[PDB]
């Protein structure tokens, strides 16, 4: 296999906090690479937090972040760890990590990026309702609503279903959020065979599955 | 002294 | 500072090439590297040191760099390609990257399907109801969407959702929901969503009346 950098879960912390999320190269090593943290607020692009050289135990830091963060790697040296103090509502992003070879600039393995949300707002199961036509080719629906925070999975089928799919980005209304999905089927198959609705919430320990 | 993360083509 | 400036849109034709530019001050003197990132997905690294590419990456995939202007090329352009681009270099011991490029690919117009769906049984226990309209796949990006309860018009009440550029068909889609409180529910009778989207004059109504549902 090649390397593969996998980061910790989905955070949630109230503003003045700290939080630490893990860069681990499953299959693979940190050692003599360039270690570099990288995050993204939503809808906004690429901002670059530091690097880190397990191996000779220098870092280089955003000025932006100099020095609020700190990264850090395992001995093994097989994880790295960015910890980010003084959390504010600003803060809040998806946070990449990633690998570069020493002395290139560039980082050719990425870590599939953990979201950290900064609020006081409490964690807040979702509510799953289906949508159907209660009243050719059929569209159906799960509406994933009122939430928090960020973010839920949603699957059809449990992923026997992606075509024909549309799940939305979620939107946020009275500091709670509200996700729709749509899938379309022939109608030669709803509902002769059924179609359930697979939403998750980690942050509450909600699972839910939804038949029609 | 930081030529640890990129080289000067 | 160091400043690398993206244009914020380049559309091409299916077949065609796309290029996008990153403008610097003497950047043909720096390294340039390019990284792909579609929605959800994590960067992925496209071009490394102005022209060279990493596995993995389609031959399609090409770069420059020589006096301002680097510059990603994306040869026969398909709708896989889909997704925002950023340019990277380093500078005075700091990494600096571009405003996303957001790359879309032209196509045929194509009018929204329209699909309307009354409150839930489970939800108006709860005690809310809530009317989704769900416009799919369409092109242009732009529509319009109108919520009218009892042929009056609404404006609060209701959120929307857009997709990005689909990565298969290249088309849009939109989810609008207009959530209320069940009593209001059940003050009115027909429930219409009507999308204005160019590809007619005429907006496409979807609806349903309580007293039939």
């Known amino acids: 296999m090649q390397v593969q950098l996998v980061q910790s879960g989905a955070e949630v912390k109230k503003p003045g906090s700290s939080v630490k999320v893990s860069c681990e190269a499953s299959g693979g090593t940190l050692s003599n690479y360039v270690i570099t943290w990288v995050r993204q607020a939503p809808g906004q692009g690429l901002e670059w937090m530091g690097g880190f050289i397990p191996t000779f135990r220098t870092a280089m830091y955003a000025q932006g972040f100099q020095g609020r963060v700190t990264i850090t790697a395992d001995e093994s040296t097989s994880i790295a760890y960015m910890e980010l103090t003084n959390l504010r509502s600003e803060d809040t992003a998806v946070y990449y990590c990633?690998?570069?070879?020493?002395?290139?600039?560039?980082?050719?393995?990425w870590g599939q990026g953990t979201l950290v949300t900064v609020s006081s707002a409490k964690t807040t199961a979702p509510s799953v309702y289906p949508l159907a036509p209660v009243c050719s080719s059929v569209t159906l629906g799960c509406l994933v609503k009122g939430y928090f925070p960020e973010p839920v999975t949603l699957t059809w089928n449990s992923g026997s279903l992606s075509s024909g799919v549309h799940t939305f980005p979620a939107v946020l209304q009275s500091d709670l959020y509200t996700l729709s999905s749509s899938v379309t089927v022939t109608s030669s198959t709803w509902p002769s065979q059924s179609i359930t609705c697979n939403v998750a919430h980690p942050a509450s320990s909600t699972k839910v599955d939804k038949k029609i | 002294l930081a030529g640890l993360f990129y080289q000067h083509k | 500072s160091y400043v690398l400036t993206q244009p914020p849109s380049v559309s091409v034709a299916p077949g065609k090439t796309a290029r996008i530019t990153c403008g610097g001050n003497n950047i043909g003197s720096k390294s340039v590297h390019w990284y792909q990132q579609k929605p959800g997905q994590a960067p992925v690294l496209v071009v490394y040191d102005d022209s060279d590419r990493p596995s993995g990456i389609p031959e399609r995939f090409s770069g420059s760099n020589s006096g301002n202007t680097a510059t990603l090329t994306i040869s026969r352009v398909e709708a896989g390609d889909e997704a925002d681009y950023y340019c990277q270099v380093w500078d005075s011991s700091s990494v600096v990257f571009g405003g996303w490029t957001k790359l879309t690919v032209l196509r045929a117009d194509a009018a929204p399907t329209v699909s309307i769906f009354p409150p839930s049984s489970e939800q108006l226990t709860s005690g809310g109801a809530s009317v989704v309209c769900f416009l799919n796949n369409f092109y242009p990006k732009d529509i319009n969407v109108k919520w009218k309860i009892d042929g009056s018009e609404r404006q609060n009440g209701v959120l929307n959702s857009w997709t990005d550029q689909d990565s298969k068909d290249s088309t849009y889609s939109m989810s609008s929901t207009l959530t209320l409180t069940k009593d209001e529910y059940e003050r009115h009778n027909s429930y219409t969503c009507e999308a204005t989207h160019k590809t007619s004059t005429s907006p496409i109504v979807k609806s349903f009346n309580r007293n039939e549902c």
């Open positions: 990633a690998r570069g070879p020493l002395s290139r600039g560039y980082y050719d393995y």
